[PDB]
Amino acid sequence: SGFRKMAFPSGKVEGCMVQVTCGTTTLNGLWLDDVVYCPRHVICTSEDMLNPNYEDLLIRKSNHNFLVQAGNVQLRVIGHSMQNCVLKLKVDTANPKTPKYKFVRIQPGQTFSVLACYNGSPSGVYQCAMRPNFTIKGSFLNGSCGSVGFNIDYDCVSFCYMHHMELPTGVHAGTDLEGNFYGPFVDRQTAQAAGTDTTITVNVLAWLYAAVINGDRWFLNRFTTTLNDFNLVAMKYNYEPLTQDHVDILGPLSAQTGIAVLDMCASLKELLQNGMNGRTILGSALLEDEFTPFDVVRQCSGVTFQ
Amino acid sequence: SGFRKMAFPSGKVEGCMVQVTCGTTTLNGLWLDDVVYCPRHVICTSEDMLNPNYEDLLIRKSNHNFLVQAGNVQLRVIGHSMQNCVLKLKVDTANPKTPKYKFVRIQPGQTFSVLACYNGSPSGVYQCAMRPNFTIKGSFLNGSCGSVGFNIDYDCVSFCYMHHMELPTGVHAGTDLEGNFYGPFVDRQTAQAAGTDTTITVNVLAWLYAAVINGDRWFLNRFTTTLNDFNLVAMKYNYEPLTQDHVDILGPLSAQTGIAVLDMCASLKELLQNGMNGRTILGSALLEDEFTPFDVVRQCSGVTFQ
Ligand SMILES: *[C@H](O)[C@H](C[C@@H]1CCNC1=O)NC(=O)[C@@H]1C[C@@H](OC(C)(C)C)CN1C(=O)OCc1ccccc1
Ligand SMILES: *[C@H](O)[C@H](C[C@@H]1CCNC1=O)NC(=O)[C@@H]1C[C@@H](OC(C)(C)C)CN1C(=O)OCc1ccccc1
């Protein structure tokens, strides 16, 4: 038993991380086969970063302008191109540690592990959720650009996120590995800001089931509610609408605990209207919304990866 | 910016993890050079596990009774011995992935990363603190024994914890890598229980500094307090006494924020006596005590590992 914010083992991604330097900008790259992927704003100077024509900026670059360091080994760049907001540096060496991988784009509400990196060296790993407003509440300092987010499915690394920038509220914005931003953000200097968020209702319900599995039952009740009546409360507390597909996804957890999904909705309704009255759930005094139903089943059952 | 519960990159430990089976018990082992380390209760049956003479149990074992699997490769055991509560299985092959390592025992209040494993396959990584009562609030299911906790210092893995068992409150108990239990727990069947815990005061102060660094200032004040007067409040709320060495350790964070340690103590005093009044700190409605001053400086500054 127990429930922790749990990241995937990071080894498979650690072996892909390299340092990319161009001009005076140093950031991280992801080295898979003979390509290094990194944010295209690496080609920018501090005055470039004010309304860039990236195509013009890139045609003025040379392969030798890109210093790529894999550990203490230099990688010769032999080609360069842009794909949307990422740069693809072709190197003369395929990464012998390339895991089986996929580039996947995730949905707001889904989680992934982030391997925070500086100077091509992994620093830490932690779990993030894609917020409904397409930001992530990460932990990133200067030099962290090019750090990736990912999930692992058996032996296959599904990369879903590349870090680009921090927004004024201290949250983070980036792209998928095709270079397409999550959300309405751009890699040019503007007053862009996160914009309004909501709470991920289905995840809170999953976490309430995690709590019950782990012995926290004080918020349970014999009350029930209808889906529509719950969704009226959800709206009032800035929670995402609950769909029948969410209810279906919560089936296995409902079955394991014997608490009907709509009963757990009634419990969430009371927690929203009443608060917790000085009590905690899984060591939290807040309703947690960054665990998916998958995450709860993963941890309250025990799957591994090879 | 941002602040997350952050584990160390797990790759160096992933390459050490193996599966140890003896009789009908399967658990994890740690393979370093030509030794596999694992909990000695692997030699126990469900009726052995009632008042064992482990020395008698072990003399009845043979090398071939121990099936050691490193991935899909079997490791021939060529010797076996006990060191306290761990077993040392000598194998005919040194682990080519052995990192530079040390066996260190940590202090209550210190943190470490746990690589949860099942069947020798890493499942997840997360950060834990050694509670003052020598338990850890982990996430462990059956088969997780032999999962290790560790810190990484530049390139060197300091192993500090091997998992053995879950206590009736759902918290976890284990040993250092010399096989010496953390706390008053034994690897035989008893009604042993955690016993009373306290809050790690110096860590809460570190986390309050993390909050200030990250822009959370609402709990600050111009009040100050004395060390003795703060420690009277600490006692009343079941917080650990704050020592002058704790104050000294908090110096760099105090200096970076410009908030005297004793001023932050005054703030903690008010938070203890008043609560938060519906506000949060670093996304928490509770005072968090599982980040050390080191952890805060690591994340609010950005160190890496090679
Ligand atoms: C790349 O390593 C870096 C990572 C951020 C620095 C602080 N936290 C981060 O996540 N990203 C940046 O520095 C990006 C590049 C610039 O963005 C464009 C103009 C769109 C190209 C500026 N920027 C950024 O994050 O600015 C906000 C910021 C906040 C805090 C500190 C520095 C910068
Ligand atoms: C080893 O993989 C296993 C891990 C625990 C199972 C559930 N959560 C865990 O952390 N450890 C055990 O099964 C240990 C071995 C036995 O302990 C001795 C008698 C001291 C040898 C029993 N045990 C244990 O953890 O019992 C409590 C328990 C709680 C919940 C589920 C199963 C067992």
CATH of the domain at A275: 1.10.1840.10
- Closest by alpha carbon to A270, among A287, A247, A283? A287
Among A122, A140, A302, select the one facing B141 at the smallest CB separation: A302
**How many helices and strands, by DSSP H and E, does chain B display?**
8, 13
Does the C-beta of A40 come closer than 6 Å to ligand 1? no
Which of A197, A228, A253 is where one domain is finished? A197
Cα–Cα separations (whole angstroms), residue B37 to A28, A303, B219, B293: 36, 23, 47, 31
- C-beta atoms surrounding B170 within 10 Å: 18
Q: Which two tokens stand for residue A92?
A: 């003369």
Characterise B185 by phi-psi region: left (phi > 0), alpha (psi -120 to 50), beta (else).
Answer: beta
Number of domains in chain B: 3
Chain B residues whose CB is inside 8 A of the A125 CB are 6-10, 125
- Closest by alpha carbon to B223, among B253, B262, B255, B250? B262
Cα separation, B30 vs B148, in Å, equals: 8
| Element holding A49 (H helix, E strand) | none
Q: Which two tokens stand for residue A245?
A: 């597909």
State how far Cα A102 lies from the chain centre: 15
Q: Which two tokens stand for residue B97?
A: 């992935």
Which of B177, B197, B217 is where one domain is finished? B197
Phi, psi of A231 (to 5 degrees): -65, -25
Sign of CA dihedral A210, A215, A217, A219: negative
Interface probe for B, chosen from A1, A281, A294 (most Cβ of B below 10 Å), is: A1
Cα–Cα separations (whole angstroms), residue B227 to B91, B200, B240, B242, B294: 54, 16, 13, 8, 22
- Closest by alpha carbon to B108, among B240, B294, B253? B240
Mark whether B139 and B205 lie in a shared domain: no
Cα angle A22-A26-A29, degrees, rounded to a multiple of 5: 90
The interaxial angle of helices A227-236 and A261-274, nearest 10 deg, is 30
Ligand 2, residue B44: give the atom nearest the CA. 21
Mark whether B3 and B39 lie in a shared domain: no
Residue linked to tokens 């012995």: A215
Mark whether B262 and B292 lie in a shared domain: yes
Q: Tell the burial category of B93 from Cβ atoms under 10 Å away from its Cβ (0-12, 13-18, 19+).
A: middle
Mark whether B7 and B123 lie in a shared domain: yes
Cα separation, A131 vs A185, in Å, equals: 14
Cα–Cα separations (whole angstroms), residue A234 to A19, A133, A289: 45, 17, 13
Which of A179, A197, A215 is where one domain is finished? A197
The ligand with the least distance to the CA atom of B25 is 2
Mark whether A167 and A260 lie in a shared domain: no
Interface probe for B, chosen from A126, A154, A288, A292 (most Cβ of B below 10 Å), is: A126
In one letter, which amino acid is B218?
Answer: W
Beta bridge partners of A162: A148, A175
Mark whether B122 and B220 lie in a shared domain: no
Resolution value (Å, 1 decimal): 1.6
| Element holding B300 (H helix, E strand) | none
For residues B186-225, one letter each, b for 16 or more C-beta atoms within 10 angstroms of the residue's C-beta and e for the rest, the string is: ebebeeeebeebbbbbbbbbbbbbbbbbbebeebbeeeeb
| Element holding B217 (H helix, E strand) | none
**Residue A259 near residue A212 (C-beta atoms within 8 A):** yes
Beta bridge partners of B37: B30, B88
Cα separation, A182 vs A161, in Å, equals: 9
**Residue B213 near residue B300 (C-beta atoms within 8 A):** yes
For residue B304, give how far its alpha carbon lies from the nearest alpha carbon of chain A (Å): 4
Helices (H), A214-279: 227-236, 244-249, 251-257, 261-274
- C-beta atoms surrounding B15 within 10 Å: 17
Which residue range forms the structural domain that includes residue B132? 1-14+100-197
The experimental method, as deposited, was X-ray
Cα separation, A44 vs A23, in Å, equals: 8
For position A59, which CATH number holds? 2.40.10.10
Cα separation, B205 vs B202, in Å, equals: 5
Judge whether B306 lies within some domain.
no
Judge whether A112 lies within some domain.
yes
